[PDB]
Amino acid sequence: RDKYYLITHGSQDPYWTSLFQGAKKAAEELKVDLQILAPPGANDVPKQVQFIESALATYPSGIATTIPSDTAFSKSLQRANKLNIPVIAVDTRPKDKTKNPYLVFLGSDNLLAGKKLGEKALELTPSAKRALVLNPQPGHIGLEKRAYGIKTILQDKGIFFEELDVGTDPNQVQSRVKSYFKIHPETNIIFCLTSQALDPLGQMLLHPDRYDFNYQPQVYSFDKTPNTVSLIHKKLVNYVMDQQPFLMGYLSITQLVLMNRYQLNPVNINTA
Amino acid sequence: RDKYYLITHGSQDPYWTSLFQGAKKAAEELKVDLQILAPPGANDVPKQVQFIESALATYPSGIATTIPSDTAFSKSLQRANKLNIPVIAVDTRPKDKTKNPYLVFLGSDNLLAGKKLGEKALELTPSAKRALVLNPQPGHIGLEKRAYGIKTILQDKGIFFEELDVGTDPNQVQSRVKSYFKIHPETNIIFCLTSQALDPLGQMLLHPDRYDFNYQPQVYSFDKTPNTVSLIHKKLVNYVMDQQPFLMGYLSITQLVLMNRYQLNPVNINTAM
């Protein structure tokens, strides 16, 4: 019974559970064992590196892991490459494969997704002159590419903008945003790099009087989580890039299995 | 301005942000300062105890805090009592205030709320065969009262039931729930003690094929969070108890202030509908 691992840097978001279920679904249909390793929070890279090192020591048939840092995983990844343990990157990938080796990547092209969302925003709300980008985890190389994409679209079109570190604590996200709007009450658009930033904002959009947030800005986000879908339906959110985490999880375990059982070579896949 | 503290044992549940906003809004209108202290997770008692302890050192005008344990907070509460710092209990309260002193309690009567949820589920779900109670926080004395209240109603009607400790990790809640249904497929009623149990469950109710969860049970819960409200509109959840956290927040800070500015005695307030 071949053993496989799916290791990530977070697990509380609805995004993670979709991805986890896709992988579990593939594991079940292909009849292989899957162990999921993820820190108790939204981000804890040193703990993730720990999981990867522990998994490697069990000589698994394959590992699918997120790689949200350009340096924190280098040693672990290099080790895995030397021991010939196939590693597939999912969700987030490093910019240098020689320093951070892995076989292929399954996920979105974060830089492009951002550009696509910025373009969509200016297309659905051309009258925009001021935008706000909410980053729940500055440093996350994947989110950094998204923000960069959006920003290149905004600047090229002359739109003013600023990126804000909101963290993941709901109360802090809401107050950082309310603080920004009091100083710039003209902000017309808000970009949420993940649903972690959207959820706290959505609550204020749903109860504008209770939160003293009647601005009614145009909002764009990433990931179609249950609450995100509800806000779209309510027309409080204009557009959301979907990375299809379930497809991502399912296909990653599938390629690892096909490689082991048939000596096939996995390939990169843009799951957007 | 006078300094006030709102201390809780959690901060991720959308329920808290609603409580926090009510407290902040009251602070704003009354022109007092308010600091909110809550562990980064969804439950951390020792951390909360330290928060209360460090708050006391600053000799604040008042403190509002949850008390989810009959033992963990005793010393801190007694200390606060000796320093003459007013303490109001919100959301959850201890069974014995002689050992755990606090002035008044603003929140709902957990036991009664549980009984009420149980009675409503039996009304709306006449076909009731077997119920499952999902506890995301064993140890939380408020949730124990809820579960107990629900079980008394279920026992009275001869409905089979079981309480399951699902924790708060979304993946684990789903896993443990699916395992139970594989063993008891006839289970047709689910009671979620908080939205922390409901969210991961709601994801499966929205994509039953993806999660291999086509049972379609009747669901009951506590706290009308955004996702909970959405699930209600989609008829995936039948009835949800509302404790009105915003009101709880607003009124608790308001009483602490009226107490300091006007020499009034605060009173207990059941915030339920």
Please state the domain count of chain B.
2
CB B91 within 8 A of CB B65: no
Most B CBs within 10 Å, among A177, A201, A227, A229, to test the B interface = A227
Non-local (6+) Cβ contacts of B236 within 8 A are B202, B205, B206, B219
Closest CA to B192 of B168, B157, B156: B168
Tally of CA atoms within 13 A in the half-sphere of A96 that contains its CB: 10
Same-domain check for residues A61 and A162: no
In a 10 Å sphere around its CB, with 0-12 CB exposed, 13-18 middle and 19+ buried, how is residue A272 labelled?
A: middle
Residue B212 gets which letter from DSSP?
T
Same-domain check for residues B88 and B163: no
Cα separation, B121 vs B154, in Å, equals: 10
Which residues of chain A are within 8 Å of residue B234 when distances are taken between CB atoms? none
Cα separation, B192 vs B126, in Å, equals: 19
Q: Is A138 on the interface with B (CB under 8 A)?
A: no
What tokens does A55 get? 């998994």
Which residues of chain B are within 8 Å of residue A202 when distances are taken between CB atoms? 226
Closest CA to B226 of A192, A233, A169: A233
CA B131 from chain center: how many Å?
21
Same-domain check for residues B156 and B36: no
Residue A168's SS3 state is: coil
Q: Is B232 on the interface with A (CB under 8 A)?
A: no
Closest CA to A170 of B164, B246, B13: B13
Domain assignment of residue A219, given as a range: 110-246
Same-domain check for residues A130 and A105: no
Resolution (A): 1.9
Question: E-strand spans in chain A?
Answer: 3-7, 33-37, 62-65, 87-90, 105-107, 130-135, 160-165, 189-192, 218-222, 239-241, 269-270
Same-domain check for residues B212 and B263: no
Same-domain check for residues B119 and B227: yes
Same-domain check for residues A228 and A117: yes
Same-domain check for residues A76 and A52: yes
φ/ψ of A36, rounded to 5, equals: -105, 130
CB A96 within 8 A of CB A67: no
Which residues of chain A are within 8 Å of residue B11 when distances are taken between CB atoms? 169-171
Q: Do A210 and B246 touch (CB under 8 A)?
A: yes
Closest CA to B136 of B148, B147, B151, B120: B147
Domain CATH number, residue B141: 3.40.50.2300
Same-domain check for residues A165 and A205: yes
Closest CA to A195 of A218, A171, A221: A221
Residue A183's SS3 state is: helix
Same-domain check for residues A15 and A97: yes
Q: Which amino acid is at B170?
A: P
Q: Is A81 on the interface with B (CB under 8 A)?
A: no
The arrangement of strands across the sheet holding B239-241 comes to B160-165, B130-135, B189-192, B218-222, B239-241
Within 10 A of A33 (CB to CB), how many other CB atoms are there?
12
State the smallest CA–CA distance between residue B16 and chain A in angstroms.
8
Q: Do B210 and A21 touch (CB under 8 A)?
A: yes
Minimal Cβ distance to B12: which of A14, A25, A170: A170
Within 10 A of B87 (CB to CB), how many other CB atoms are there?
27
Strand pairing class (A218-222; A269-270): unpaired
Cα separation, A172 vs A200, in Å, equals: 9
Cα separation, B226 vs B102, in Å, equals: 32
Closest CA to B18 of B257, B259, B192, B271: B271
Residue of A nearest to B36 (CA): A171
φ/ψ of B22, rounded to 5, equals: -65, -40
Q: What is the CA radius of gyration of chain A?
A: 19
φ/ψ of B100, rounded to 5, equals: -125, 75
Cα separation, A220 vs A205, in Å, equals: 13
Alpha helices in A157-218 (DSSP H): 170-183, 195-206
Same-domain check for residues B45 and B136: no
Residue of B nearest to A247 (CA): B210
Which residues of chain B are within 8 Å of residue A14 when distances are taken between CB atoms? 170, 199, 203
Q: Is A21 on the interface with B (CB under 8 A)?
A: yes
Most B CBs within 10 Å, among A178, A210, A229, to test the B interface = A210
Residue A163's SS3 state is: strand
Same-domain check for residues A122 and A232: yes
State the smallest CA–CA distance between residue B158 and chain A in angstroms.
35
The secondary structure of A70-110, three-state, reads: CCCCHHHHHHHHHCCCCEEEECCCCCCCCCCCCCCEEECCH
Cα separation, A122 vs A126, in Å, equals: 5
Residue B239's SS3 state is: strand
Cα separation, B153 vs B151, in Å, equals: 5
Q: What is the CA radius of gyration of chain B?
A: 19
